[PDB]
Amino acid sequence: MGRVRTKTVKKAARVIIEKYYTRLGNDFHTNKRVCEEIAIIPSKKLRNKIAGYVTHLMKRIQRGPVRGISIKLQEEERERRDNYVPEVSALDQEIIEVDPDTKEMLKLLDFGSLSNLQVTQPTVGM
Amino acid sequence: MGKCRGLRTARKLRSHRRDQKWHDKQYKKAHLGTALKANPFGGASHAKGIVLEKVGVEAKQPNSAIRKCVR
Amino acid sequence: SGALDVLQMKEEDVLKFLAAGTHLGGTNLDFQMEQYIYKRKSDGIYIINLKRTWEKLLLAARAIVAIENPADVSVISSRNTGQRAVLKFAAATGATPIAGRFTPGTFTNQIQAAFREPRLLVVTDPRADHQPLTEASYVNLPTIALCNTDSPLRYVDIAIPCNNKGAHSVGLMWWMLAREVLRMRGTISREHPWEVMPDLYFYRDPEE
Amino acid sequence: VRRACYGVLRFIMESGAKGCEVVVSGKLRGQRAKSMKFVDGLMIHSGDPVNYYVDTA
Amino acid sequence: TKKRRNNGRAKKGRGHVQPIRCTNCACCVPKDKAIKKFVIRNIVEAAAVRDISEVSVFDAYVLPKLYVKLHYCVSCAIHSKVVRNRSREARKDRTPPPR
Amino acid sequence: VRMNVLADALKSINNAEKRGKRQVLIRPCSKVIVRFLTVMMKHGYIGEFEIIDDHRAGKIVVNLTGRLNKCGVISPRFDVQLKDLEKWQNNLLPSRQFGFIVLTTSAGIMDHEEARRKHTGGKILGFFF
Amino acid sequence: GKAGDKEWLPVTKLGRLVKDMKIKSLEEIYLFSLPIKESEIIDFFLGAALKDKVLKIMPVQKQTQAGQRTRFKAFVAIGDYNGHVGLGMKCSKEVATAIRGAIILAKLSIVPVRRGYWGNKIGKPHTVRCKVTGRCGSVLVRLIPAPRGTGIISAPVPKKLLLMAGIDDCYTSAGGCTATLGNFAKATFDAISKTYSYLTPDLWKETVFTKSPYQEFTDHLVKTHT
Amino acid sequence: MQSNAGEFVDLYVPRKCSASNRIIGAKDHASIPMNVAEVDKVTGRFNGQSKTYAICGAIRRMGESDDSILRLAKSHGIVSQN
Amino acid sequence: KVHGSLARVGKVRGQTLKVAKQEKKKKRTGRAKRRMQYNRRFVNVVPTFGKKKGPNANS
RNA sequence: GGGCAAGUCUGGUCGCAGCAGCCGCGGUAAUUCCAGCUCCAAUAGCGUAUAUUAAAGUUGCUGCAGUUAAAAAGCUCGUA
RNA sequence: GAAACCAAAGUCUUUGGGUUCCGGGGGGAGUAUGGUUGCAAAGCUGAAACUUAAAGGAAUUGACGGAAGGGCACCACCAGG
RNA sequence: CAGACACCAUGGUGCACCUGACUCCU
């Protein structure tokens, strides 16, 4: 219920993750001594809360990027997987069933395709 | 606003303006002669009179002092 | 206009307008977008005029063209379907992409987390980008907006009619508007169309 | 009153202060008590570091 | 000023209407200026149905429903919280909450 | 009904220039309406206008420009013996440097400028600036 | 012994073109109709005759959970006597903070007013070309031009405001509430920016629609950002 | 706004619009030009000078500027398919 | 209300008293008085010194 | 004391005496008193009273306001 | 537009469609006074003396509620000692 | 949504107050 983590732990631990994601681990006494090594924390107990929340973060972030913190190794890899080719934007929807007014737009664009029909049971859309 | 306006309405606004002007507090009592009637001035600038009595008036609140008028 | 022929829609464009579904629109009555509507479907779904799409696709590009920097062209996509597209627009055009929230104050707000100095804004949906459109109106910024048949039009400068909502109609126009500027200024010069497909474009669709 | 508290409060900030505040408290302009607060910089009051971090007169 | 625009409920297209009492206070309020309420409710409510339906023998007949149209005066709608104090921006809302 | 066929038309074109609108459908089209339209057409406050001939009362479609700021009516009209004309140029025109007042005078409907040049008044119509 | 300093900083494309002697006057931006977020742009261009007028520092207040809470609502106007006037309102807890705040708000909000002639055609403008007006809470402040030698016939609050314009010859007739003086000057500020807003036939000669000196200087604007 | 024949009274000349025939004033916001590049004439590789069109906020806040430049860029040229 | 009894007349005037102050130089009158009022206020020394006063202000 | 120019004077007074058109002082460290002094103002005048004109677009002809501040008749026909 | 709000409570100082009705700070008071109707009840027309620098309107901000909706403390309860 | 709802009166007072400058001469 109590001693929930305020702004000071989470803002400090975030900078620690994105720079030290190799040298951080998931053992506290590693990361407590790592936050001795890599950080200047004015209390051991504050270092207990920070490096413990680092172990909270490192457990989360080794499950990929979690909300509120991310690493560019994970972030750019999303963009590297975002070379995704779904189409060539030519299916071919060359002649297939389209709207008759799209057909009339295709008539104004001189290709044409199969046209929808039958105003029946109106509202068309109901 | 809100009024009739035409080319024969000089007869109207002659009646309409003064009759609305009668609703004025300053226009009514000054033209009722009541300021001459209720008050001794209105028909005088200075007026001489006999002292009836000297009235040492304790002021109704606020401004706590004694007014000390004369009748 | 440039090379007038492929600037009068090629079937490669025409199929892609049908492929991305840009020709479709909403169901709502307009008074500023009904000129851009070609026809309406049975009991109302608006086929927009792709002529009005392309001719505004040209001129709004020509507004960006002969600005000697894409850096003062801040292109805006709060829609995630265009966030890959403005990533691939800024990859191609070099413009300034704006993804997601405007963070109100980049154009106002001396004391702020940010400040931007654009000249022309390009918008996926002026209802989804009204907070750009507010601070566009605050500090004298013209704004290109992709507008469908239900879009707002107040403070909206030159508007390209597209379906531009949800579908690949978003990422096709960013494929096409980065086409048109590299058509005008680029290595895809002299008004030639692209050889880059809109698959470097259309949005991520979380993969396997 | 303000001008001397413009002069010194600047000057103690000119020589340097994380925070610096000036209080002139009590009667002024007759029988009424007043307090004149002239604060510059950052002043904290939490817990233990209120006691260490200040220079008070 | 008009603290309410429709003043409980509008009377537009109607010069004058018929009044109604409160269903729980008998206070005279107009029909289209009061709080109405339909009630579709079982006659076999869930306190008894765990024992009625077991002793309901030769009863493959479904649970019956009671149909009550309630009408409150505004004074006994508010203190009983049939309706209640909303914000004036919420006072624009003509929306009944769902059942 | 339309007691003033000009004031019903002036509220049209002022609201049109409020909208920036470049067309109006005015009616019941007196010639007195037309003569005001011709003069302000000459002064470049507006463009040209095109009447559509109807046998009801006729209607005019007017292409205007945004050079006008206020066109008002003297409703009801009054007589001008060329001595009140300056006070309307005082009280109702913004300066004596611009602003035109139109009058029906017995040498025809004209502005205030030919009214002073001919010295023959009539009835006052309205103004435009 | 105590002295002040000034450091220039551009936060926009304009303030670079200000500091690099590419924009030389507000008259450009007044033609360009562009925003200004740096009052020092004005101070880069004129820096002189811009009379600061502390109108009213009126103590306004809000009641709180523990008694009340008050602030000084200072009305500081700027203007040189040349056709450019400004106004700043700063609601601060102090007086001089509300003054020196609304000083800079007057500096940033200086606007041009268009002076002209009464019935004159020459003589380096002395009044407005047109009767102008403005309201702020039912207080209508109408201005009427006068010829030369007449003077500024006004209430004492617009008389200073018409003075700062250089409109030296004007008549007034005001109706509304008689005591709310901040609404007097704010209604008066409506009429003076209306001087450009009236379309003179001298203003029928339209312009060439200038070409956005953001774009005209965007290569010169390359300092750390175009 | 000028005075006597050669003498200029006004501080400047405020801009205008072609869509409402209305001036663009002093510090007016969303009151902008629209510089549209002259792209050239099948030879290509756009020719420099952008076509300028001044837009006020009034036609913007009334949402008119889309058809307005369509009445200024299509009507005056140059644009393909028109 | 109804009350009409006086209590004290000149109660403060019997305990607040007056003197006079004689002219070392005269009260100059009319012409050279109003002439003196401009030249004394400005050109004596020509004003180069001072701020924040009225001509009687202990302020 | 402000409005309202020129006493955050000097003394006394202490909600008294008084003052104060109005807004207001005086209940003790009175800038409202009462005086001194100083200053301001006009000036052989200045001040008051009352009267009326403006200010006053608070009578609004120009040029008032009538949902909530005053002010659309219960509604309609209907003549002048 | 004072805001409240209002395509009307817009096209008003850039002041004018036409016609009718009504207000001139707050009272005294629709009382007096007379008219007037109505069977009456009462209805209608309609004051003064005197009283006053405020009355009023929206809106902001508090505070309050036998207004309503949230949370917490044995200086509050519970169970208790 | 879908179990049971009593009366409870009064009460009072002063201070929110109208401008700028920086020759500390270091």
Numbering used by the authors:
A (entry chain e): 1 to 126
B (entry chain Q): 1 to 71
C (entry chain f): 2 to 209
D (entry chain g): 115 to 171
E (entry chain k): 2 to 100
F (entry chain a): 2 to 130
G (entry chain c): 38 to 263
H (entry chain b): 1 to 82
List passages from the publication reporting this PDB structure:
During eukaryotic translation initiation, 80S ribosomes are assembled on the messenger RNA. This process is highly regulated and can be divided into several phases: a ternary complex (TC) - consisting of trimeric eukaryotic initiation factor 2 (eIF2), GTP and initiator methionyl-tRNA (Met-tRNAi) - binds to the small ribosomal subunit (40S) to form the 43S pre-initiation complex (43S pre-IC). Subsequently, this 43S pre-IC complex attaches to the 5′-end of the mRNA which contains a cap, forming the 48S (pre-)initiation complex (48S). The 48S complex scans mRNA from 5′ to 3′ until it identifies an AUG start codon in an appropriate sequence context (Kozak consensus). The largest and most complex of the initiation factors is eIF3, a ∼800 kDa complex.
